[PDB]
Amino acid sequence: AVSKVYARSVYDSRGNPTVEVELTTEKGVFRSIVPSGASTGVHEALEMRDGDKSKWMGKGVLHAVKNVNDVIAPAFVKANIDVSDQKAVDDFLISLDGTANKSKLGANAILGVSLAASRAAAAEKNVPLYKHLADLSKSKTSPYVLPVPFLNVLNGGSHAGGALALQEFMIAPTGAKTFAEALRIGSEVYHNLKSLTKKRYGASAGNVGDEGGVAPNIQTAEEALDLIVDAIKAAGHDGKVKIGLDCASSEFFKDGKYDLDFKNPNSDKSKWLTGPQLADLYHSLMKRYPIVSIEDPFAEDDWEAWSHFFKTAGIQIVADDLTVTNPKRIATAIEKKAADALLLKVNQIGTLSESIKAAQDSFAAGWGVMVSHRSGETEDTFIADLVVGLRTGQIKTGAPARSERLAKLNQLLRIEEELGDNAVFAGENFHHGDKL
Amino acid sequence: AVSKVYARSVYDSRGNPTVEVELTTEKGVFRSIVPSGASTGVHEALEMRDGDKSKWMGKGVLHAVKNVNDVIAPAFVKANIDVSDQKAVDDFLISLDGTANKSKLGANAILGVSLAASRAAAAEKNVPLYKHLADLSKSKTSPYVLPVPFLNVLNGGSHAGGALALQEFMIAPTGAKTFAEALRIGSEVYHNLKSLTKKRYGASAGNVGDEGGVAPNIQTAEEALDLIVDAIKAAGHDGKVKIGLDCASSEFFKDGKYDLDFKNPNSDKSKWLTGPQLADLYHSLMKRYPIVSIEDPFAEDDWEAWSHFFKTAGIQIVADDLTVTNPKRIATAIEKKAADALLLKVNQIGTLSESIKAAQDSFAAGWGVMVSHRSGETEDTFIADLVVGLRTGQIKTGAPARSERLAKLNQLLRIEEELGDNAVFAGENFHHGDKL
Known part of the structure; x- marks a missing residue:
């Protein structure tokens, strides 16, 4: 008691x-x-x-x-x-x-x-925490699913100089066969990206942002994307590693239009894009790079851009700011076929029961669930056990740098080792790890 | 068993x-x-x-x-x-x-x-770990001493662009009356320093180095020192907070001379300094800024520069690379009156018994002991309990940023709270916290 x-x-x-x-x-x-x-x-x-x-x-x-x-x-x-x-x-x-x-x-x-x-x-x-969490959420326990980590390697947006509007560039080792293997691959690409950055942008380019990625002064999405693809190529993990984007599009939405040069500060309104022209720029990027997840591609109340886009997306579309882990917001989102994955932030709702509830309703509508860290994390590894008990197959917890990020990745190493043959890595089935 | x-x-x-x-x-x-x-x-x-x-x-x-x-x-x-x-x-x-x-x-x-x-x-x-550690080292336990944390706020040297040769600039809240109070003050100065940096050097200047400090492109020690003094002034903690320097002078020692423009790469050998001219530049800085600790002011085998300097230093001089937590190296250092404080890195010697032994011999010669973190830290908080059981009064564990650093500072919050009136903060007696 x-x-x-x-x-x-x-x-x-x-x-x-x-x-x-x-x-x-x-x-x-x-x-x-x-x-x-x-x-x-x-x-x-x-x-x-x-x-x-x-x-x-x-x-x-x-x-x-x-x-x-x-x-x-x-x-x-x-x-x-x-x-x-x-x-x-x-x-x-x-x-x-x-x-x-x-x-x-x-x-x-x-x-x-x-x-x-x-x-x-x-x-x-x-019982271990992850198992208790599996009981509360009534998740399958045979076997358990280890997630594909979405590692932040590079930041733009409100996180950097340069004109780059998209906020986070993540790599996802979907091609690994174990969590231990995906984490090792992910660190090598990361280490390779750091080298290239320091090389092409100078030593200050080597410093990390809040979550562990670099934030050099990059001009365009293509520039940033090209650098990550080079880093993937140099770590020798070409084809095994994918890219995830967090556009944080709420940040550059103004006047019912999207300003890709929002740090302008003389940004040509002739150049802002409507939902549909933005959909077009993402389609472009999607054809050229191995992108498998786009988070907040449109602003938090731009419902019609979501829906339209969502129709031809064909990749995982994550609602973060649109849903703010709010079930009233989740239901509309579902109702409207705005996206198909929820970014779950336990502290956006404030209680473990409501967090689980929000994941279950998502799952019932066929959405996937990406468990996520906050900007201001701690040494607490609770999200490592939660993503395993929820059986989601994907977690967004930072670059493989700064121990508020690594504490969680170390914890998944440990759970993985402990489960023996009772664990499978979600791999390419990250979207639906719940149904594995 | x-x-x-x-x-x-x-x-x-x-x-x-x-x-x-x-x-x-x-x-x-x-x-x-x-x-x-x-x-x-x-x-x-x-x-x-x-x-x-x-x-x-x-x-x-x-x-x-x-x-x-x-x-x-x-x-x-x-x-x-x-x-x-x-x-x-x-x-x-x-x-x-x-x-x-x-x-x-x-x-x-x-x-x-x-x-x-x-x-x-x-x-x-x-018993709590810190108490067990106090028993192994035969430290006084009444009361226990909470250390002044030496917080890394800014880096130069091999850590940044700019011509700044000195490696780390640390702040030390000696004027606080509690560890909780020193940690709060230290974070406000830090937060203020970040603001000024982003202001005067741009957004990329906001990114942190391995240990949590900023690494803008600064040209001189005075420039860097001036920025920290401004940050102290703006947090409103003028007089309560001191500065600690880690020069890592081994990095710019060449030909029996010290190159303060070692990133040169066209550094005028006409401009390199001998031990004694270097002693002179530190004396200067020491008169102008509230510096209370200088770490590795001369190269690891430049015994005569240490001794000479040490004669008129009048502040705490820390041997790090000169002693490498090696007792044979510690004995010479003592013998020669090269410094009066040891930077203890438990993993430089590899065993808890030998780490304690190295602190005890230091203490027996009247040296102080600064417990320190590594570049590559973890979520393990062992050094938080060690600095308390060793009763040293000073720890160097990073900026109040990145949880591999904060895990240790959080742990000292906890021990402090737990000791009640059985704990004193070393304050201004950091040098000799062992004799309090």
Whole structure:
């Protein structure tokens, strides 16, 4: 039984405060660390920041920590909840908060307790976390599926100088036969990309962005794409490795048009593109490069560009900003045949029960699910166990650099090794790893 | 009793393979992850890499993993060693290897087992690791000392474009009264430095180097120093925060002279400096900026420049490359009054017993000890517990960015919170935190 709920402030991969919760039970102390989320709300669970400019640039989570310590803890202990009953845990928490975006208590206070309890339930059930997660979500367990990691190697957009508008360029070793093998291949291409970058753009080009990719001053998508294809060729893994794009198109959508030179700052409106001209530029790229996934190709409310595009896409289309892990937003998205894969960010919704629910509805409509990291990650490896229990077949967790990224990839190495013949790598079936 | 010793390959913060060892005992599985070290040996324990160019760019540790699995494990189990008896563990391991630089078995195979056993001993003794470490080293335990963290904020040297020869610029919040307070202050200066950098050098200037600092194209030490002082001023922590320098002077020493424009590549030999002219440039910087620590100010065998300088330094002088955590090298260094602080890199020597021994001899000569991270770190937080048990008062573990760095700073937050009034922050007494 839960005898104590405690929260403290710790730092995230960007040096910003975040919430760490500790749950005590007769089996020990279970901990969770929350990735840094949004504190101003779309259709998303809100994260609560002190706003005190004289401290941490106004990003303490001292309140959020007080909410755990002062409100949840007391109530939760007395509630005598069975941690095994996750829905009960979550329902408890949501009822305590009483708002729709966890703005009363803060999504950060709530999620920390929600995740610590699944750790506590797995201990108690005496099963590895991934297996407990498979039980909560009613996933097939024979065998388990190891995901194709979508490794960030290069960034543009709001992440760099240069005129490159698309935000992330990812590589996906679909051709490997094991997770260990895909991770080794992925690191060699990455290491090769770094060499070429330092070579063609200079030593400063070697520095990494928040998630581990390089961010040289590149001018076009083709330029960036060409560099990655060269790196694939040089690591000698030509044909085994694919590309994934995160366009973050919400960033350059203005006036019902898309500005590919949004860092302009003298961008010719004669040159902005409509949904359909943009669809045309992606078709082009798609014919020339091994792209198998495009994330947020159109803006978060540009429903008709999604649908139109989606009709002839023929590759995996991931909704991230369009759906914001919101089931009302997921249902429309499905209804409209806007995409076929959901980017799941557990902290965009704030609770493990609602995260699982959002994956299940996706799966029921034939969508795939890409589990994802946040910009501000921690040393917590929870998403490694979740992507395995959800059986999704694909995770987006950073470049094979910075341990907030590698902690998760190391954890999948370990689970893989532990499952023996009870594990299969999703490979080329990443889209539908759930149906393998 | 140790019932099983197992090793696997996992990745380090740079995406390169490294060794993870698991030790099983009747209390559970204790794990350790080794930072990436040297595989070609100075006067240092050698790290063993497969050299197979067709795999991980020739950096697998598959052999090293075989050494654990195939040689140590079998032998160690049968030896029936008491993990509590650390010296016995280490002596066991060294005897198994039989070379002076752990080149038989690989320092990476050996250290992993050496550290897993101290974890196992602490479990068994039912004490926190830091307390077990305090027992092995016979450190005062009342109260414990929390260190001043030396945070890397900016890099030059072999780490950047620009003509700046000095390698690392660190900030040290000596004026804080708690570790939690020093870490918050340190992050605000850091965040402020990032803003200024992006401002004055452009968006690419915002990308971080291996350890978390920025690496803009700076021309001189003064330029870099001025930027940090501005950042200190803007975070509003003027006077509470000091600067630490790592010159890595071995990198620009040529012909018995020091080339401050070593990226030249047309560097005027008319302009190289002798020991004594270099001593003069540091004296200058020291008068103008709040510098309290200089690391490797002269080259690793330039004994007379060290001594001369050391005579009038009046600040902490850290030997890193000069001593390479080697006690024969430490004794000369002491004998010669070359410096007064040792940079301790547990993996430069390969064993916890020898690491502690090297700190004790330093302390006996009145030197201070700065515990340090490696370029290629992991998610393992062992150095957080070590700096507390050794009672050194100062640790060098990266910028407050990248979780291979923050994992250790988060761990010190936790220990601090746990010690209650039994902990003091070394503050301004960082040099001698051992004597507090």
